[PDB]
Amino acid sequence: FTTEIHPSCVTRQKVIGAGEFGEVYKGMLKEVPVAIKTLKAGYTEKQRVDFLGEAGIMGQFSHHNIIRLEGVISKYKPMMIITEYMENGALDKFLREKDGEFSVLQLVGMLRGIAAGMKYLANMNYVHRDLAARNILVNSNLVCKVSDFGLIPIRWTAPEAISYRKFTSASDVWSFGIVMWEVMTYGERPYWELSNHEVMKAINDGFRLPTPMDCPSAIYQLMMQCWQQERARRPKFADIVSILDKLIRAPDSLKTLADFDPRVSIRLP
Template sequence: MHAILFPPVLLKPCLVRPPLWGAEYCYFHTHSILGIKTYIDPDTYEDPSLAVHEFAKEIDPSRIRIERVIGAGEFGEVCSGRLKTPGKRDIPVAIKTLKGGYVDRQRKDFLREASIMGQFDHPNIIRLEGVVTKSRPVMIVVEYMENGSLDSFLRKHDGHFTVIQLVGMLRGIASGMKYLSDMGYVHRDLAARNILVNSNLMCKVSDFGLSRVLEDDPEAAYTTSGGKIPIRWTAPEAIAYRKFSSASDAWSYGIVMWEVMSYGERPYWEMSNQDVILSIEEGYRLPAPMGCPAALHQLMLHCWQKERNHRPKFTDIVSFLDKLIRNPSSLHTVVEDVLVMPDSPGEVPEYPLFVSVIDWLDSIKMGQYKNNFMAAGFTTLDVVSRMSIE
């Protein structure tokens, strides 16, 4: 996988408002690099309420009808309801509320997520409808996702989907992550619990508040001086040195792939966090879930490369999944059938991503037999998987 090198781009600064430093205030506002908007950290604003109004629309609370409580967030309840749009149409929404008795710090943390979400515009990223900040309760209003979080949705429908449907879900998540990565935003907490699913099985990346409690299970988050980290989903360099990047998001994406293909199983099962950290360090990687196509487990293993520069970029992941979707026979070979996979899941093979028999032969250093395979009719991985010794 080769990075595409672009010529340097001159960024034009635009004077907006003072961030936290300096007497002469200059601020690089939303600018375009090769036509792609870049993300601005709301913490660079001296007053966080200015950031939220820069990126989120204020909604008149009379346009919101709260119907029922659907969950609890760190800061208050999450409800479903309806929002009357300026065109007088009612649309379903989810409403996060900030519970009474909050301090300014909590209000700032709560609205920070809206300041982040409001900068994004992509079909696979949860859409912010707006905020209520001028009356109580303070609210964040987002599009409503009928099927809730991906992990519980998959557990509820264990075994119900075709491999192509699952790959379609993974492709949507990768597309959303490619968009975030192109904008220079690092998610840090990519996990199936933070992906929402609508009635069309469309997956959208959500949960952009970084200060929240990451999991209810105190065992599941490892505390460092900079806050809690969800160990099972986090790349080794991010756990050890807090080096978060799009490459650490790619590691987490590999775990999300595993969660999807196992219908919401818990990564590393009942292993303790400390055992997970030590096992990863020693080279252990999650084995393929039952019935998982070999090509998908290979992609997972690529995402879990120890050296972060060796992991695929989200643009590579999207194009690889597109190839699989266009060539469904490449998904017929499941890991149990592929004799060349390592005996121990602790070994990470250095295979390139492949979708054709020719690529596969090259990857196992048998490229000289291409013509023999083609002549004998072994033209797809599916046919190869059914080869017998005769």
Template sequence: MERCDRGNLADAVRAEGLLHRRGPDGVLRVSMGLLYTVLLDVAAALRYMHSMGLVHLDVKASNVLLQTTAGRPGGFPVAKLGDLGLVKLLGDSGSLVNRSTSGTLTHLAPERLQAGSLITPAADTYSFGVLMYELYTGRQPYSGQDQGMELMRAVFNGLRPVFPDSTPPGYRALAECCWSRHISARPCFEEVVGRLQDQYISCRQGRLA
């Protein structure tokens, strides 16, 4: 197995400040170029998994591992999606019947909270949208709220994390599209990768993403 020498993404974001820098004015700013780099790594991994008929079902920052890799600008690590304990193989129909709510409650798609519902790759898309919030803000979603049945009901009924006003509009729009209540409205990862690449290019050119 490969050794991911930089630990997991959640620790790197919160403890090391991997994606955030405090400016001379004391304001904490997001390094959007680095953020897009991480998200593209994870999105490409999910695109590959889905092309193989697999769903991850536990996408979150602590399940993304970081590895030092030669060739990355500034020595920035490669992000690798790990913890495959909940991975499922989809049937020929491209879905499977949901039989449990295993996973991380804050990142679970609403259909994962309902026994007997159909699980599709869109469940990972939902979690990816929550990951986008988690990485942009450097905070756990729904922090300070009880992580039990009340939160489950609220998420099922439409509760979502709230981005700060400083969030680039395109970034926010993609995350909100990913965590749509309607499965059919969530983009596939081919589209997610394309939209992230476009936003990354805009970011590098000094335009708002």
């Protein structure tokens, strides 16, 4: 059902991270570069179910803005999940290393792509639960692909998911709003140094993240509506994609900027 790759076609080269019960590698597939997640000897029944379940769901997704599965090794050990390789890595680190290097139109384009991937997931009845810039990969065309590397992300999570574990595509919309703020700030840490409890207290008291610098008014308005306490009031991903698409296609719309609240005053004559 899911494309099975023979192990002789896979060459693991470099460790790039860790999995639930295995490592993640960069490698080559027979040669196309790939990323490879392994499940190592001793894995439990639950871990096998979760691993092959992940491969199965990934193999069903076919969208420009969702990481693409090349295939799986399930008939030999170690088992492996093999995806396309994204040369620019994770979005959060990418933007922190490229501060100021992109145009507003490029940044908004990345958000449209993320939103289109999320619309697809939500429509497929897949709730992500961990949407954050650390879980988005960037290719050499600046295309953002929603992914999930595994883990608690209080600062990205909607109030109802924190409070009573209600994870839905509307809590993913909240998280998307946070991602919008991450992108427009080049990977600033949401809420800066506030502790997790201080973040939750602030949200419940009605505070929201302030405008990024150089942020189109329309983009700030959209992120703010993703952060409505009442789940039913938030936009759906279809609404988000539509808005972002219309802003990009009429790019003068992005020239009107929201006011940035200075945290520091410098007086010169």
